């Protein structure tokens, strides 16, 4: 039906409020759906953005679970699935979208939530829901480059795109060239691998792989996919094989491993990205930075380097022993078949 196509409009212009109109459509949002900052003047808006719209999508007012946890993450904050706390927030939102078992109720929940939660988080939570519900299946999700270009492009272009779009009329707009080999000069021999590290393609492949095979979700379903453990091993293992190949093609040696975490990290990297959602830039890492114990009270991270070292020591032991131990205390054997997985 249309509903499937109407959800794809949510991906359009993630930070523009949902009442501003996406493509050649616009949403007819209830006033209790309007965000607290805009609701007190809301009417003056529905009128203001009503123009230039062919279609109007109606939206019914539904129950809506508590979105406390989803709203806990700031709107101008970054979102990563590696951070323990974010995992619990996303998994909770995913749970809401997942829990509305008709395509019309999903549309209503989405439209409401969209302007209250972190765009990056919304995009993830929706992407995961749509891809793994039955009614919304084999639906072509818009490329995350197109919805979040800030994670894929030198920040310098943004003020050129703003200039070009404001000054020059449509149709006469020049294509904006995206800078390549821009993160480091030739004093850093690492800069040669820009065409791999910083290539749009491979970064999209990595992001998407983690979409379809998360390690945290709910129940076994949508995490328990055949041999995902071996997949995780192999896929990442092939990344480095391919990287090591590309290294040899740039007169470099094989990538050296992180032997031990106490020794400095020789290779710094300033990524040159500016998050338009966080309105800040990503921090760089200097040459010879050292790993340090984390105490990020907000993010719910209290981890010492020694914790990491302890995990490694134990994993090595298991691998050499040839078996692991489950919570219960029993032994499971790392055999030829399922060991790697």
């Amino acid at each position: 039906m249309n509903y499937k196509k109407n959800l794809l409009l949510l991906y359009d212009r993630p930070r523009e409020p949902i009442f501003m109109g996406k493509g050649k459509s616009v949403f007819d949002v209830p006033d209790n759906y309007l965000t607290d900052r805009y609701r007190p003047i809301g009417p003056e808006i529905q009128n203001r953005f009503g123009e230039l719209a062919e279609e109007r999508i109606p939206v019914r007012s539904i129950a809506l679970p508590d979105l406390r946890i989803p709203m806990s993450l700031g709107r101008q904050e970054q979102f990563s699935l590696f951070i323990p706390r974010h995992r619990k927030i996303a998994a909770r939102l995913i749970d809401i979208f997942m829990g509305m078992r008709n395509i019309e109720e999903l549309q209503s929940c989405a439209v409401f939530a969209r302007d209250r939660i972190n765009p990056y988080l919304f995009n993830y939570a929706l992407s995961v829901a749509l891809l793994h519900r039955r009614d919304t299946k084999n639906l072509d999700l818009p490329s995350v480059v197109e919805v979040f270009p800030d994670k894929y492009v030198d920040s310098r272009v943004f003020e050129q795109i703003r200039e070009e779009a404001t000054v020059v009329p449509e149709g006469m707009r020049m294509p904006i060239v995206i800078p390549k080999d821009f993160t480091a000069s030739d004093l850093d021999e690492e800069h040669r691998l820009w065409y791999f590290r910083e290539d749009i393609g491979v970064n999209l492949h990595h992001w998407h792989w983690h979409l379809v095979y998360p390690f945290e979700a709910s129940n076994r379903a949508i995490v328990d996919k055949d041999r995902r453990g071996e997949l995780f091993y192999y896929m990442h293992s092939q990344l480095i094989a391919r990287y090591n190949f590309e290294r040899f093609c740039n007169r470099l040696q094989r990538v050296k491993r992180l032997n031990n975490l106490r020794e400095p990290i020789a290779e710094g990297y300033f990524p040159k990205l500016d998050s338009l959602v966080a309105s800040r830039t990503w921090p760089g890492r200097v040459d010879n930075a050292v790993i340090k114990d984390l105490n990020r009270e907000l993010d719910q991270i209290k981890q010492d380097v020694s914790d990491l070292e302890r995990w490694i020591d134990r994993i090595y032991e298991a691998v050499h022993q040839g078996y692991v131990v489950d919570e219960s205390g029993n032994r499971i054997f790392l055999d030829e078949e399922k060991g790697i997985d």
Binding site: E317, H320, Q321, G322
Partner: protein, 307 residues
């Protein structure tokens, strides 16, 4: 078991888990100067068994390894008064005598010896090529041990002779816990004791720890290194002897032909490998009747004697 685990002999019950600890250590220590081979340099002296003992770090690495073994030995139960008593046998004294020297006194010095290195000198005009080595040497001596039987039958016994330093840095009698680890084996031999009194005499050159000059120059500890150097002013040392019951120590099958068994059921370093039993505190109260202690003095003389 632990020995095969540490250093890794194929006899290790699980090489994969407990590793190749001693050997890998020798390699690490020998490659500090070029660990990734970027300088195309070979290993230092600690990387070859032939030369490893030349480096001081050898003794540090081997010292560590020993502490690990010790950690096991201190878990073993102390030898009971019973276990190291020989009912009937009593050692009443041990002494040492060198020709032209007071009783209970050992002497050391330097000595040049000659070796033909001719067979090893490639592309050198044929002939003899004698090299003069200077090395520590000790004056010959002999132990004299007074043992009483008081049984009425011929008693078999193992004579076990160790020597350690006498005192600490503060100048007192060393405590057992410390001293037990500094005892160096000097001899171990079988003896037949007649009823009543027995005077046992044993030459330094009969030592079962040592092998003759002729074997080295022409496996066994070098004979000339049997005695510590000592000081010019004299170095105080406790000489210790124990007679154990050979019937228990016997093993029915430098020391004849080597290819079968170790001929002693007791642990290696047997009197002192384990911790002291309750109440014991120093050597002089560790002793049982069938043991004896003697103050020896080790004198060095900086001179070069001929052979």
């Amino acid at each position: 078991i632990l020995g095969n685990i540490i250093e890794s002999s194929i006899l290790s019950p699980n090489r994969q888990l407990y590793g190749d600890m001693h050997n890998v250590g020798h390699v690490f220590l020998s490659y500090t100067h070029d660990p990734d081979h970027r300088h195309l340099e070979s290993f230092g002296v600690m990387g070859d068994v032939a030369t490893a003992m030349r480096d001081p770090v050898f003794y540090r690495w081997h010292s560590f390894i020993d502490d690990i073994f010790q950690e096991h030995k201190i878990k073993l139960p102390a030898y009971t008064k019973s276990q190291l008593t020989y009912e009937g046998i009593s050692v009443t004294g041990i002494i040492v005598q060198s020709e032209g020297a007071p009783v209970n006194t050992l002497h050391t010095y330097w000595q040049q010896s000659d070796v033909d290195l001719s067979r090893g000198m490639d592309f050198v005009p044929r002939g003899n090529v004698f090299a003069r080595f200077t090395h520590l040497q000790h004056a010959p001596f002999q132990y004299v041990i007074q043992i009483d039987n008081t049984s009425d039958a011929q008693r078999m016994g193992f004579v076990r002779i160790f020597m350690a330093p006498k005192n600490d840095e503060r100048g007192q009698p060393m405590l057992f816990r410390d001293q037990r680890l500094f005892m160096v084996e000097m001899d171990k031999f079988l003896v037949a004791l007649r009823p009543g009194a027995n005077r046992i005499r044993r030459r330094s050159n009969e030592s079962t720890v040592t092998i003759p000059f002729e074997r080295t120059f022409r496996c066994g500890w070098p004979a000339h290194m049997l005695v510590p150097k000592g000081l010019p002013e004299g170095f105080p040392a406790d000489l210790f002897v124990m007679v154990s019951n050979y019937e228990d120590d016997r093993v029915v099958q430098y020391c004849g032909v080597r290819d079968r068994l170790y001929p002693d059921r007791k642990a290696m370093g047997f009197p002192f490998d384990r911790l002291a039993r309750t109440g014991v505190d120093r050597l002089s109260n560790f002793v049982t009747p069938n043991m004896a202690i003697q103050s020896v003095n080790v004198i060095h003389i900086d001179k070069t004697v001929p052979r």
